[PDB]
Design an enzyme around this catalytic site. Structure first.
Site, PDB file in Angstrom:
ATOM      1  N   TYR A 179       0.853  -1.218   0.000  1.00 11.39           N
ATOM      2  CA  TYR A 179       0.000   0.000   0.000  1.00 11.39           C
ATOM      3  C   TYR A 179       0.879   1.255   0.000  1.00 11.39           C
ATOM      4  O   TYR A 179       1.929   1.264  -0.683  1.00 11.39           O
ATOM      5  CB  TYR A 179      -1.041  -0.075   1.122  1.00 11.39           C
ATOM      6  CG  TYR A 179      -2.286   0.717   0.819  1.00 11.39           C
ATOM      7  CD1 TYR A 179      -2.989   0.470  -0.337  1.00 11.39           C
ATOM      8  CD2 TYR A 179      -2.742   1.746   1.646  1.00 11.39           C
ATOM      9  CE1 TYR A 179      -4.115   1.197  -0.664  1.00 11.39           C
ATOM     10  CE2 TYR A 179      -3.858   2.504   1.313  1.00 11.39           C
ATOM     11  CZ  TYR A 179      -4.567   2.209   0.158  1.00 11.39           C
ATOM     12  OH  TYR A 179      -5.693   2.879  -0.247  1.00 11.39           O
TER      13      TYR A 179
ATOM     14  N   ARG B 177      -7.330  11.599  -5.378  1.00  8.32           N
ATOM     15  CA  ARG B 177      -6.270  11.614  -4.323  1.00  8.32           C
ATOM     16  C   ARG B 177      -6.716  12.515  -3.172  1.00  8.32           C
ATOM     17  O   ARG B 177      -6.946  13.705  -3.387  1.00  8.32           O
ATOM     18  CB  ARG B 177      -4.891  12.006  -4.843  1.00  8.32           C
ATOM     19  CG  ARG B 177      -4.512  11.297  -6.141  1.00  8.32           C
ATOM     20  CD  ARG B 177      -4.646   9.790  -6.074  1.00  8.32           C
ATOM     21  NE  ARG B 177      -3.766   9.108  -5.122  1.00  8.32           N
ATOM     22  CZ  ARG B 177      -2.474   8.932  -5.266  1.00  8.32           C
ATOM     23  NH1 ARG B 177      -1.803   9.452  -6.287  1.00  8.32           N
ATOM     24  NH2 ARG B 177      -1.847   8.206  -4.378  1.00  8.32           N
TER      25      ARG B 177
ATOM     26  N   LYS C  89      -6.267  -1.589  -1.104  1.00 14.22           N
ATOM     27  CA  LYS C  89      -7.027  -1.357   0.141  1.00 14.22           C
ATOM     28  C   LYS C  89      -7.817  -2.616   0.497  1.00 14.22           C
ATOM     29  O   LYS C  89      -7.795  -3.024   1.707  1.00 14.22           O
ATOM     30  CB  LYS C  89      -7.938  -0.131   0.072  1.00 14.22           C
ATOM     31  CG  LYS C  89      -8.486   0.331   1.416  1.00 14.22           C
ATOM     32  CD  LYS C  89      -7.431   0.952   2.284  1.00 14.22           C
ATOM     33  CE  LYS C  89      -8.031   1.739   3.423  1.00 14.22           C
ATOM     34  NZ  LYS C  89      -7.144   2.805   3.926  1.00 14.22           N
TER      35      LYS C  89
ATOM     36  N   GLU D  94     -12.258   5.671  -0.504  1.00 15.38           N
ATOM     37  CA  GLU D  94     -10.789   5.740  -0.360  1.00 15.38           C
ATOM     38  C   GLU D  94     -10.259   6.801  -1.328  1.00 15.38           C
ATOM     39  O   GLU D  94     -10.583   6.723  -2.526  1.00 15.38           O
ATOM     40  CB  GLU D  94     -10.187   4.337  -0.571  1.00 15.38           C
ATOM     41  CG  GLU D  94      -8.695   4.294  -0.311  1.00 15.38           C
ATOM     42  CD  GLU D  94      -8.278   4.357   1.159  1.00 15.38           C
ATOM     43  OE1 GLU D  94      -9.149   4.392   2.030  1.00 15.38           O
ATOM     44  OE2 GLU D  94      -7.052   4.347   1.419  1.00 15.38           O
ATOM     45  N   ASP D  95      -9.444   7.734  -0.822  1.00 21.55           N
ATOM     46  CA  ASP D  95      -8.535   8.573  -1.639  1.00 21.55           C
ATOM     47  C   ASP D  95      -9.379   9.449  -2.564  1.00 21.55           C
ATOM     48  O   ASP D  95      -9.036   9.617  -3.740  1.00 21.55           O
ATOM     49  CB  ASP D  95      -7.557   7.636  -2.363  1.00 21.55           C
ATOM     50  CG  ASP D  95      -6.210   8.216  -2.721  1.00 21.55           C
ATOM     51  OD1 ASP D  95      -5.801   9.158  -2.087  1.00 21.55           O
ATOM     52  OD2 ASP D  95      -5.582   7.699  -3.643  1.00 21.55           O
TER      53      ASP D  95
ATOM     54  N   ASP E 184     -12.141   6.089   5.186  1.00 19.49           N
ATOM     55  CA  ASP E 184     -11.022   5.718   6.056  1.00 19.49           C
ATOM     56  C   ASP E 184     -10.090   6.906   6.268  1.00 19.49           C
ATOM     57  O   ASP E 184      -9.645   7.065   7.423  1.00 19.49           O
ATOM     58  CB  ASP E 184     -10.205   4.550   5.526  1.00 19.49           C
ATOM     59  CG  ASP E 184      -9.189   4.176   6.577  1.00 19.49           C
ATOM     60  OD1 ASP E 184      -9.607   4.004   7.743  1.00 19.49           O
ATOM     61  OD2 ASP E 184      -7.998   4.151   6.249  1.00 19.49           O
ATOM     62  N   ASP E 185      -9.801   7.690   5.229  1.00 17.77           N
ATOM     63  CA  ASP E 185      -8.903   8.874   5.311  1.00 17.77           C
ATOM     64  C   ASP E 185      -9.397   9.844   6.410  1.00 17.77           C
ATOM     65  O   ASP E 185      -8.582  10.327   7.168  1.00 17.77           O
ATOM     66  CB  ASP E 185      -8.857   9.647   3.982  1.00 17.77           C
ATOM     67  CG  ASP E 185      -8.334   8.888   2.777  1.00 17.77           C
ATOM     68  OD1 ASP E 185      -7.368   8.152   2.931  1.00 17.77           O
ATOM     69  OD2 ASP E 185      -8.951   9.022   1.694  1.00 17.77           O
TER      70      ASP E 185
ATOM     71  N   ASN F  55       2.890  13.246   5.973  1.00 16.65           N
ATOM     72  CA  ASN F  55       3.520  12.207   5.107  1.00 16.65           C
ATOM     73  C   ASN F  55       3.877  12.814   3.750  1.00 16.65           C
ATOM     74  O   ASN F  55       3.114  13.647   3.252  1.00 16.65           O
ATOM     75  CB  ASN F  55       2.569  11.031   4.889  1.00 16.65           C
ATOM     76  CG  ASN F  55       2.532  10.055   6.044  1.00 16.65           C
ATOM     77  OD1 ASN F  55       3.541   9.444   6.404  1.00 16.65           O
ATOM     78  ND2 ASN F  55       1.356   9.885   6.617  1.00 16.65           N
TER      79      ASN F  55
END
Ligand SMILES: O=C(Nc1cccc(S(=O)(=O)Nc2ccc(OC(F)F)cc2)c1)c1cc(F)cc(F)c1
Ligand SMILES: O=C(Nc1cccc(S(=O)(=O)Nc2ccc(OC(F)F)cc2)c1)c1cc(F)cc(F)c1
Lengths: 544, 544
Positions: free
Chosen positions: B86, B139, B157, B228-229, B251-252, B399
């Protein structure tokens, strides 16, 4: 059942209407491509990797997903892909990346399965197998014993029959006969998955290989058995043991000589200097080198009906001790006696040890590099051959490019473009004074696929030397007056399907002439047979 | 049917007797391995590659051949494999190596299939789907628009649900909603296979995403839908639109805050300095950063029953202009108003712009790095926090390692081992005076798999914030008195199955308390329910 089956999967080549009908809409990204477009895309994906091993790894994933797209990509880029999908990348993948072959359909034999070989073949569940490539991983050149990992060599060789001669990819079987390994790293490697023991002695070796040949003859009766990459201690004795009793050949021995002879006789045609006027130094005197010389002689005898004794007298064999002569004072190995000079004195023999002095004495018109001892065809030696002919024939055939007797660039430079060159490796063109020269590569791909396709159709009881000699002549005659005017010794590699269909046709006609052909359905006249052979070939196009 | 089926293939783990019975003797090299041996072998094959992308490529071929061996290898080496399978390797594979995802089972939607979404789901032929991961490739961090290639993110994921919570690999679906791309290279790339157009406007975006949610709710009614994303322009509005009507989460947003809150409250326990004594600088003031702060407050309120108003007053929010205060003179974004100081003068606000002067004025005991502007927690700033607490809590969560507010090594060095550190990336241990320190990594893997497993079993009508808060508390309480004595803020990552089973159990009990659970088969007492949840998890072991 469609996407997950690599033989019928088309990927993005499925039209919108096909995707709806097949209930796979939304299983693929939406772009629809032609196969040509898919090939260009795959070619870009391959070139995104710098190292050969990584390009091979990518091509393995294409083959596992879309087999038609894989073979389509190889045929569009054959000359460039050849060094990646076979020698020398494939042996590197066997030696250090053997996991690249895990997913591939092959057959593993060893002593633990003694008496079960036939059951194992039955269980493999193949229909009407045409080609079987078998190795023991011992290596023809005796470098890098691969043991069990030799399966990768059979897998790569089988893929060259499919690409080169349209052997249907379902009708070919790669085989490893694991009789142990002398690879010390492997014998100690916790991750070696083969038989962890030194190679079996000859008696047990032949018990297991006899069982293989007999099992195969019974369960795969339509197959040609091709021996690949067996060591010199066995490869010649294997052919002697089986050539009459089974439908089998060895590409390293019989293929190499067929290809080199075809190229060499075209080099002679271009040279001016006719076959009986040639004076040929054969640098290297192993069984293989002598086999190539004899194959040249046999081909010149077939095409021109010169007495073979007279062609044999064109050859000057050089071993590690010097010019092979009857007056030299040593006891010659059996294979060296036939080509030994009878016309050179004891006193002259004593002064014929270095290649430079042999060349000065013999005044050769040809240098054949089969020596495997690095770059022996020095500038001084090439300059002397220029004294003996307007068109020196120089064939540095030792592999790889470092063991080679001379670079084509050097040969062309030193001769100012006069050298007629064939190589055992691809080389880029050389330009001298605005004139371009490129060596002719004697790749084994020119012969084995067409022998495999001819023997698959004709179903001969066995493969006598006549069928290899026919294949050698067929290849020679496919070099067009145009190709010859441009200095090519071989038809172009990218035309391999047409080459294979012609070679196959000529092999079939020879088997028919000898009455060893078991397939009574085939045409018996060349034009009609060629048309038939072309239609029988599997083509990497979407069919249904 | 056995070797070619990646779900039941065992490769060399088939015993000699099994190979004979299954008629696959001679389809495999002869060594028989246990799964543990196969895992060690695969781990060696992965480490033979230096670059992450090449390790990922190898793991893709293992997953395609032996799915049990793939998941077994990930679980034996989880911390090391996480960065490969990932973030951040998976996004690099999507961006430049998208062919790595071609063979994987996923679902592709776009505007061309408007009104067909339900038919496409039916045709995919899944049974009782539990988890669906959907992206549009936009993203969350708005770097590297992947378009269609975002399918690789959903695929990676989904594999973390299977590895982390034993979601059966057949019951998970990766989805790409291709609504275009603003990736200029892609829009011009002849090999881009997605919708070749700029991203659709909000109205068409929501038409297609509404159809997706409705189709999924009907055809995959047992599924949790995880976003996701998705980019910031949509990810918050998506949750507002669907959270009550569908079984869905992001989830983010929701996972990150659950994980960071759990770690932070354990950092508070270790610090000495209790939650109402903490003075927390929140460096960064985006919706996400404020979401994390609010999740910390909500968790401290649940575990300790402090008035939430009093916990909110522990936070000092820093945006690009400086300390967020009511007296600063600007009109604050809605999400910044709740955490705005009411106790700081206009005159003090004017002199609270640089992080160094804010830290000097606030005298914080905690620095939370959610800033995404590089290394703002300087030696001078860390030295000032040492004046305010014996145990500075320092969380550089931005990050990758370059955007991070401070290295754990620097934090430990500057504080002589006193710093309590959590990171958004794995770091090697630091040794100071013979004493070893290692940061606690707040990986999202701690929460989403257990939420997915709890929501798959409980079948709640929807996923209210109560279930995320329960998951956050569950995670906090799994850090043992032993783990805490060794300075760990989280249970160990390699115990992810036990973590997921506990998180799942606590989520189920919460859904049961709220009476939103639709699965009436489950135990309603913790011990019995945990035993049940563990037995329901798919395990990467050979079963039959
Ligand atoms: O074939 C599938 N998808 C596909 C998606 C894009 C493109 C293509 S392609 O066939 O048009 N090109 C292609 C292919 C595989 C390459 O090898 C290496 F990259 F995967 C390289 C290129 C194919 C496929 C196969 C399955 F078994 C399951 C499934 F869900 C999808
Ligand atoms: O599974 C097969 N062979 C196998 C041969 C050695 C070892 C193994 S293994 O499963 O024990 N290990 C293994 C596997 C695949 C890895 O991925 C990447 F290397 F191929 C990596 C390791 C498996 C297989 C599968 C087929 F569909 C057809 C077939 F003829 C063979």
């Amino acid at each position: 059942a469609i996407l997950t089956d690599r033989y019928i999967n088309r990927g993005t080549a499925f039209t919108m209407e096909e995707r709806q009908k097949l209930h796979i809409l939304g299983r693929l990204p939406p772009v629809v491509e032609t196969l040509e477009e898919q090939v260009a895309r795959v070619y870009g994906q391959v070139k995104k990797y710098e190292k050969p091993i990584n390009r091979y790894q990518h091509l393995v994933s294409v083959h596992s997903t879309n087999t038609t797209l894989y073979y389509a990509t190889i045929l569009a880029h054959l000359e460039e892909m050849l060094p990646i999908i076979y020698t020398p990348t494939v042996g590197e993948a066997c030696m250090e990346y053997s996991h690249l072959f895990f997913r591939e359909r092959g057959v593993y034999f060893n002593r633990l399965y003694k008496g079960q070989f036939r059951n194992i073949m039955r269980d493999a569940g193949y229909q009407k197998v045409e080609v079987v490539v078998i190795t023991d991983g011992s290596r023809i050149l005796g470098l890098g014993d691969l043991g069990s990992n030799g399966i990768g060599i059979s897998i790569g060789k089988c893929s060259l029959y499919v690409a080169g001669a349209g052997i249907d990819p379902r009708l070919i079987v790669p085989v490893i006969l694991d009789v142990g390994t002398n690879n010390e790293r492997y014998l100690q490697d916790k991750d070696y998955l083969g038989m962890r023991e030194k190679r079996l002695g000859d008696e047990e070796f032949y018990e297991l290989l006899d069982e293989f040949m007999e099992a195969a003859s019974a369960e795969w009766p339509n197959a040609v058995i091709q021996f690949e990459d067996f060591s010199n201690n066995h490869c010649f004795d294997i052919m002697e043991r089986y050539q009459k009793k089974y439908r089998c050949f060895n590409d390293d021995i019989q293929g190499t000589g067929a290809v080199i002879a075809a190229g060499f006789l075209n080099a002679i045609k271009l040279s001016g200097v006719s076959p009986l006027q040639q004076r040929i130094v054969v640098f290297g005197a192993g069984s293989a080198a002598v086999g190539v010389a004899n194959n040249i002689a046999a081909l010149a005898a077939r095409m021109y009906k010169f007495p073979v004794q007279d062609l044999v007298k064109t050859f000057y064999l050089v071993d590690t001790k010097g010019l092979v002569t009857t007056t030299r004072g040593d006891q010659l190995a059996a294979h060296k006696k036939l080509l030994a000079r009878t016309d050179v004195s004891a006193e002259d023999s004593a002064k014929l040890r270095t290649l430079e002095e042999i060349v000065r004495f013999v005044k050769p018109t040809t240098l054949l590099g089969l020596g495997g001892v690095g770059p022996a065809f020095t500038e001084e030696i090439v300059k002397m051959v220029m004294q003996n002919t307007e068109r020196p024939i120089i064939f540095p055939l030792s592999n790889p490019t470092s063991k080679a007797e001379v670079t084509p660039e050097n040969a062309y430079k030193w001769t100012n473009g006069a050298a007629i060159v064939a190589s055992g490796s691809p080389f880029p063109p050389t330009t001298i004074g605005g004139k371009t020269f490129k060596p002719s590569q004697g790749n084994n791909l020119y012969v084995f696929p067409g022998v495999g396709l001819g023997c698959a159709l004709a179903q001969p009881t066995h493969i006598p030397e006549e069928l290899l000699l026919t294949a050698s002549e067929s290849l020679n005659l496919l070099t067009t007056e145009g190709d010859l005017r441009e200095g090519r010794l071989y038809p172009p590699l990218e035309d391999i399907h047409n080459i294979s269909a012609n070679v196959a046709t000529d092999v079939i006609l020879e088997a028919q002439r000898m009455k060893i052909d078991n397939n009574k359905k085939l045409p018996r006249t060349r034009d009609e047979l060629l048309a038939f052979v072309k239609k029988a070939m599997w083509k990497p196009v979407y069919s249904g």
